[PDB]
Write a protein that binds this ligand. Structure first.
Ligand SMILES: [Co+2]
Lengths: 204, 229
């Protein structure tokens, strides 16, 4: 949205870059930050931890009713069965979409997000527009922003992560996928489907 | 505190900006901002709750429109100054230096294996906030409770849109670090944690969606009984 008071994006980026490099230089001199530490953190969340991990959990739940029960009972302990867990997913609670219920997750107060299964959140999740509106008009938001129509008779449950509990949506398994392999099913599972702002992909 | 950051239910913030795809990090400074969290956490700048409180104290106009990881930078500086680990005048001086000389080197430094060990351990091991306490849970599934109307100036996790509202306890999770003490430097003081269900009609009034609910996590002091069975 237009703000006549706001600098250009280029000028903003320039100022931030100088600010951050200055702070970086000071933390480096204190001995508490190093270039290898920076590079390691970046490598982990660019290449190692991402929504492909959540997808593996989803397709296991889809194809293993006992695992699904465990997943819905204690999310953190179930994901650990797949070697998945850690930072900002110490306490995961998974919630199941059904024909009667649709779940959608938000952090209205900041940006809380289940890093070990989804990686770092996309910027729209962290931004005020989504966060303000989804607890107030989830049905309209899903339709207007995500092209996702949840019938007014179908209950929408919005999960606001105000604590260290991290909520993750187990999307419904798409029709037409009977007997698909776990790798084939995984192609249908998106980060958006595990936030609840979209369903899993239709077979098409 | 009642900051603008507490945006749940706020109107007028505009359409969602959602590009078809985006990188994890949009710029190199973002990687640095990101990695500074474990670095300043390890160095005792702040814990997780204090980290959030630093952001909540931003200029709200700046908060509403700045790149996300700029929020993180603001809270590092906040706590750096609070703890006396960051000299603000030196930071301003260095900012101008790198303004005029953006390609100047960073200070010479030794790499430290223990920082990499810390990173890997935090990432794959986590930083669990769950704690054991000597008291049993005061509430249980099905209890009808009312959220506090307290409006502390310091850090809390009391979104304005749930204050004074009535809902139903959905789950007791055990006890966790309590934000209202931890975020204000008053220690973990763990409290039992509950998910509470609030109907849209309770939250937004009698025009609200009759088939929607918001689930919100409440520490024990946030809620008191209305009724039990
Ligand atoms: Co958050």
């Amino acid at each position: 949205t237009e703000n006549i008071l706001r600098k250009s994006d280029e000028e903003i980026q320039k100022e931030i870059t100088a600010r951050v490099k200055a702070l970086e230089s000071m933390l480096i001199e204190q001995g508490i930050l190093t270039t290898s530490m920076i590079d390691r953190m970046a490598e982990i969340y660019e290449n190692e931890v991402g929504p492909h991990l959540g997808a593996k959990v989803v397709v296991k739940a889809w194809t293993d009713p006992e695992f699904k029960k465990r997943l819905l009972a204690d999310g953190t302990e179930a994901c650990k069965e797949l070697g998945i867990g850690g930072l900002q997913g110490e306490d995961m609670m998974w919630v199941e979409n059904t024909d009667e219920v649709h779940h959608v997750v938000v952090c209205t107060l900041c940006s809380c997000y289940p890093w070990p299964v989804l990686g770092l959140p996309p910027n729209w999740f962290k931004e005020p527009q989504y966060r303000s509106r989804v607890v107030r008009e989830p049905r309209q938001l899903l339709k207007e922003e995500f092209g996702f129509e949840v019938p007014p008779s179908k209950e929408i449950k919005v999960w606001d992560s105000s604590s260290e509990m991290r909520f993750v949506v187990l999307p419904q398994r798409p029709a037409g996928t009977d007997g698909w392999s776990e790798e084939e099913l995984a192609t249908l599972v998106t980060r958006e489907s595990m936030i609840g702002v979209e369903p899993a992909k239709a077979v098409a | 505190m009642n900051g603008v950051y507490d945006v749940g239910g706020t109107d007028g913030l505009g359409p969602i900006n959602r590009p078809a795809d985006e990188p994890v990090f949009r710029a190199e400074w973002e990687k640095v901002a990101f990695a500074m969290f474990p670095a300043t956490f390890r160095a005792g700048f702040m814990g997780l709750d204090e980290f959030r409180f630093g952001i909540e104290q931003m200029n709200p106009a700046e908060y509403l429109e700045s790149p996300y990881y700029w929020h993180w930078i603001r809270t590092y500086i906040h706590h750096g100054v609070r703890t006396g680990k960051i000299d603000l005048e030196e930071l301003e001086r260095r900012t101008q230096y790198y303004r005029e000389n953006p390609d100047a080197p960073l200070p010479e430094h030794e790499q430290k294996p223990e920082l990499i060990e810390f990173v890997n351990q935090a990432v794959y091991g986590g930083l669990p906030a769950s704690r054991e306490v000597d008291r049993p849970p005061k509430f249980k599934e099905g209890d009808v409770v009312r959220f506090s109307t307290a409006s502390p100036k310091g850090h809390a996790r009391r979104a304005r849109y749930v204050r004074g509202k009535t809902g139903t306890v959905v789950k007791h999770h055990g006890a966790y670090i309590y934000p209202d003490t931890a975020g204000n430097g008053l220690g973990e003081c763990p409290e039992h944690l509950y998910t509470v269900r609030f109907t849209a009609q309770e939250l937004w009034g009698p025009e609200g969606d009759p088939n929607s609910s918001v689930y919100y996590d409440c520490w024990e002091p946030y809620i008191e009984l209305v009724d039990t069975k």
